[PDB]
Design a protein around this motif. Structure first.
Motif, short mmCIF file in Angstrom:
data_model
loop_
_atom_site.label_atom_id
_atom_site.label_comp_id
_atom_site.label_asym_id
_atom_site.label_seq_id
_atom_site.Cartn_x
_atom_site.Cartn_y
_atom_site.Cartn_z
N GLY A 152 0.80 -1.21 0.00
CA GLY A 152 0.00 0.00 0.00
C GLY A 152 0.84 1.26 0.00
N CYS A 153 2.09 1.17 0.45
CA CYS A 153 2.98 2.32 0.42
C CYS A 153 3.45 2.68 -0.98
CB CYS A 153 4.19 2.07 1.32
SG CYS A 153 3.81 1.39 2.95
N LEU A 154 3.16 1.84 -1.97
CA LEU A 154 3.62 2.08 -3.34
C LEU A 154 2.59 2.94 -4.08
CD1 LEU A 154 5.20 -1.35 -4.34
CD2 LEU A 154 6.01 0.45 -2.82
N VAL A 155 2.49 4.20 -3.63
CA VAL A 155 1.37 5.05 -4.01
C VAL A 155 1.34 5.38 -5.50
CG1 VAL A 155 1.02 6.09 -1.74
CG2 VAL A 155 2.73 7.05 -3.31
N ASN A 156 2.47 5.31 -6.19
CA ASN A 156 2.51 5.59 -7.61
C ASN A 156 2.28 4.36 -8.47
OD1 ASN A 156 3.33 8.42 -7.13
ND2 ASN A 156 5.28 7.50 -6.49
N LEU A 157 1.78 3.27 -7.88
CA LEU A 157 1.52 2.05 -8.63
C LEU A 157 0.33 2.25 -9.56
CD1 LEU A 157 1.83 -1.35 -6.73
CD2 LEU A 157 2.88 -0.58 -8.87
N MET A 158 0.53 2.00 -10.85
CA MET A 158 -0.55 2.09 -11.83
C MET A 158 -1.05 0.74 -12.29
SD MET A 158 0.50 5.46 -13.93
CE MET A 158 -0.21 7.04 -13.45
N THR A 159 -0.21 -0.29 -12.21
CA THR A 159 -0.56 -1.63 -12.68
C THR A 159 -0.08 -2.64 -11.65
OG1 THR A 159 -0.61 -1.17 -15.05
CG2 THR A 159 0.00 -3.40 -14.35
N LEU A 160 -1.01 -3.45 -11.15
CA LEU A 160 -0.73 -4.53 -10.21
C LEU A 160 -1.23 -5.82 -10.84
CD1 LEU A 160 0.47 -5.37 -7.53
CD2 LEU A 160 -1.65 -4.69 -6.38
N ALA A 161 -0.30 -6.65 -11.31
CA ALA A 161 -0.63 -7.91 -11.97
C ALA A 161 -0.44 -9.04 -10.97
CB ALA A 161 0.24 -8.12 -13.21
N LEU A 162 -1.55 -9.60 -10.49
CA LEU A 162 -1.52 -10.66 -9.49
C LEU A 162 -2.19 -11.94 -10.00
CD1 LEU A 162 -2.58 -8.58 -6.34
CD2 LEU A 162 -0.26 -9.39 -6.82
N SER A 163 -2.14 -12.16 -11.31
CA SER A 163 -2.78 -13.33 -11.89
C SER A 163 -2.03 -14.60 -11.52
CB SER A 163 -2.85 -13.18 -13.41
OG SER A 163 -1.71 -13.75 -14.01
N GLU A 164 -2.76 -15.72 -11.50
CA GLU A 164 -2.22 -17.05 -11.23
C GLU A 164 -1.51 -17.10 -9.87
OE1 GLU A 164 -2.29 -19.93 -13.01
OE2 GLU A 164 -3.03 -19.36 -15.01
N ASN A 165 -2.28 -16.86 -8.82
CA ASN A 165 -1.77 -17.02 -7.46
C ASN A 165 -2.78 -17.79 -6.63
OD1 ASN A 165 0.89 -15.31 -6.69
ND2 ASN A 165 -0.20 -14.28 -8.36
N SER A 166 -2.63 -17.74 -5.31
CA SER A 166 -3.58 -18.35 -4.38
C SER A 166 -4.19 -17.30 -3.47
CB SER A 166 -2.90 -19.45 -3.56
OG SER A 166 -2.58 -20.56 -4.38
N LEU A 167 -4.41 -16.10 -4.00
CA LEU A 167 -4.89 -14.99 -3.19
C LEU A 167 -6.31 -15.26 -2.73
CD1 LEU A 167 -3.37 -12.28 -5.46
CD2 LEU A 167 -3.17 -12.12 -2.96
N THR A 168 -6.53 -15.22 -1.42
CA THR A 168 -7.87 -15.25 -0.85
C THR A 168 -8.36 -13.88 -0.39
OG1 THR A 168 -7.02 -15.77 1.36
CG2 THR A 168 -7.53 -17.62 -0.09
N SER A 169 -7.45 -12.94 -0.14
CA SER A 169 -7.81 -11.62 0.36
C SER A 169 -6.73 -10.63 -0.02
CB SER A 169 -8.02 -11.64 1.88
OG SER A 169 -6.81 -11.97 2.55
N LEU A 170 -7.06 -9.34 0.13
CA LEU A 170 -6.14 -8.25 -0.13
C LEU A 170 -6.16 -7.28 1.04
CD1 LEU A 170 -6.41 -7.37 -3.93
CD2 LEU A 170 -4.49 -8.37 -2.67
N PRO A 171 -5.00 -6.73 1.42
CA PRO A 171 -4.98 -5.84 2.59
C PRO A 171 -5.70 -4.53 2.31
CG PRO A 171 -2.85 -5.84 1.50
CD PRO A 171 -3.66 -6.93 0.85
N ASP A 172 -6.39 -4.02 3.34
CA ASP A 172 -7.08 -2.74 3.23
C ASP A 172 -6.12 -1.57 3.08
OD1 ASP A 172 -9.02 -4.67 4.53
OD2 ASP A 172 -10.33 -2.92 4.36
N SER A 173 -4.82 -1.78 3.35
CA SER A 173 -3.83 -0.74 3.11
C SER A 173 -3.73 -0.36 1.64
CB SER A 173 -2.46 -1.21 3.59
OG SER A 173 -1.91 -2.15 2.68
N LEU A 174 -4.13 -1.24 0.73
CA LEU A 174 -4.10 -0.93 -0.70
C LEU A 174 -5.03 0.22 -1.06
CD1 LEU A 174 -3.74 -4.35 -2.53
CD2 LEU A 174 -2.01 -2.74 -1.66
N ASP A 175 -5.83 0.71 -0.11
CA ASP A 175 -6.65 1.89 -0.33
C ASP A 175 -5.82 3.09 -0.75
OD1 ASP A 175 -9.10 3.33 -0.36
OD2 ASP A 175 -9.75 2.27 1.45
#
Length: 480
Positions: free
Chosen positions: A59-82
């Motif tokens: 979430g500290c990566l405030v200038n992130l424009m593209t987050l590619a998280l395909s093909e993982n085992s993600l069940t949740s995402l942190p609320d810090s990504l707000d």
């Protein structure tokens, strides 16, 4: 791969102040929290890993424009990504997501959101916050209902809700006027809202494999519709003005439906369409002059229909290139076949043809002739003039002989003569220079084969099973 190699790449990225980090395919189970140091990151590629979640430090990566998280085992995402207020693209495909993470609903800056291939059961009403969404992909999930708040995504261009369990569509879908491509295929959809006509820019609409009993007349307003696929539905009739109002239609598939008869409409029905597919239906007849205005109609498929005859204007389909009249009850095929001079592919399988017309010889462009499962006792002598013929399938027929001059079909590569009554094969079989496959199986009294078959240079596959034959051409490598 190892945690040390990951930390190297992070220290790498810091050294050159790189805007992109590609930690893909490194089998990372848990991402180092040191990723917070790299604030200059515009693109973060973390696809094809073992991430069950993400560190809040992302979430500290405030200038992130593209987050590619395909093909993982993600069940949740942190609320810090707000705090990712500049994130345009979120790729969460091929994960174990049983729902959309709540933080996603608060990332109003998202323009493209990919949620393909998950276990997502519901789409919350808070989806209205992501109004800036241009593409929303929730294909291959378990969504049973879509919220009416879907209509607040006014900037939506592409919507993929395919391969779900949608039984209906919210009428407020009509409020997404900018939708060009809408895929609702492989759902349990029983109907479409009349508000589908408010989608005036609809170019591609996927409706195959649903439970649609009918199509609303309002779909005529979507004049930009190029292709309409109604495959595997319960549709028996079409709105009278639908096909004529869809002036941009180049293909139309009503296969696997309850159509008892051709759609009722004016001549502009099939005027613009290039391909016409009605297989697996209960149509009893093709109408006179149904293709009068259909100058561009190249392909017509009437497989598995109740056609017992052909119309008196059969020969007028000069523009017909590919023609499929298989699985029908056609007793004969008239001499007027000489008219379809441009016909390249002709499929008359699973029918009741006893003879073939002499007008077939006029078909100098014919390259594929499938006559499997018929009662053919003979063939025409003019069949030798079908010089362009490449595939001739005569399986399951009553042929005792092969016409003299059949060897002049020098372009023929596939000759299926299985399950016939052939007692002899002409020595002219050797001048078939390009013959690659010769199936002679299940011929009870095929006692001898010509040695001239050895002159078939390209002859690779041969089947003499269930024949009084123990000898093969020399070029044939058997499998016994």
């Amino acid at each position: 791969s190892s945690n040390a190699e990951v930390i190297k790449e992070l220290n790498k990225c810091r050294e050159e102040n790189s805007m992109r980090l590609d930690l893909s395919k490194r089998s990372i189970h848990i991402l180092p929290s040191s990723i917070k140091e790299l604030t200059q990151l515009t693109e973060l590629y973390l696809y094809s890993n073992k991430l069950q979640s993400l560190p809040a430090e992302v979430g500290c990566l405030v200038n992130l424009m593209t987050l590619a998280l395909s093909e993982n085992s993600l069940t949740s995402l942190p609320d810090s990504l707000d705090n990712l207020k500049k994130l345009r693209m979120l790729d969460l495909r091929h994960n174990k997501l049983r729902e959309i993470p709540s933080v996603v609903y608060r990332l109003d800056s998202l323009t493209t959101l990919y949620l393909r291939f998950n276990r997502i059961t519901t789409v919350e009403k808070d989806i209205k916050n992501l109004s800036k969404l241009s593409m929303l992909s929730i294909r291959e999930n378990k969504i049973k209902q879509l919220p009416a708040e879907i209509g607040e995504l006014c900037n939506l261009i592409t919507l993929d809700v395919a391969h779900n369990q949608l039984e209906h569509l919210p009428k407020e879908i009509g409020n997404c006027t900018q939708i060009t491509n809408l895929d609702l295929q492989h759902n349990e959809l029983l109907d479409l809202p009349d508000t589908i006509g408010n989608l005036s820019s609809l170019s591609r609409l996927g409706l195959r494999y649903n439970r649609l009993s009918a199509i609303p007349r309002s779909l005529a307003k979507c004049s930009a519709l190029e292709e309409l696929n109604l495959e595997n539905n319960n549709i028996s009739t079409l709105p009278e003005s639908l096909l004529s109002s869809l002036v941009k239609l180049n293909s139309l598939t009503l296969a696997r439906n309850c159509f008892q008869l051709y759609p009722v409409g004016g001549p502009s029905q099939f005027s613009t369409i290039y391909s016409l597919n009605m297989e697996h239906n209960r149509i009893n007849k093709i109408p006179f002059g149904i293709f009068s205005r259909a100058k561009v109609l190249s392909k017509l498929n009437m497989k598995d229909n109740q056609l017992t005859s052909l119309p008196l204007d059969f020969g007028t389909w000069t523009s017909m290139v590919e023609l499929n009249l298989a699985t029908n009850q056609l007793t004969k095929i008239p001499e007027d076949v000489s008219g379809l001079v441009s016909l390249e592919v002709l499929i008359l399988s699973n029918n009741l043809l006893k003879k073939l017309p002499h007008g077939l010889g006029n078909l100098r462009k014919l390259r594929e002739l499938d006559l499997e499962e018929n009662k053919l006792e003979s063939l025409p002598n003019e069949i030798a003039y079908l010089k362009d013929l490449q595939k001739l399938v005569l399986t399951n027929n009553q042929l005792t002989t092969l016409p003299r001059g059949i060897g002049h079909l020098t372009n023929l590569t596939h000759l299926g003569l299985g399950e016939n009554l052939l007692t002899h094969l002409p020595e002219e079989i050797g001048t078939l220079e390009n013959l690659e496959e010769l199936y002679l199986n299940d011929n009870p009294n095929l006692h001898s084969l010509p040695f001239e078959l050895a002159l078939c240079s390209k002859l690779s596959i041969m089947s003499i099973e269930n024949c009084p034959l123990s000898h093969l051409p020399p070029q044939i490598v058997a499998g016994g």
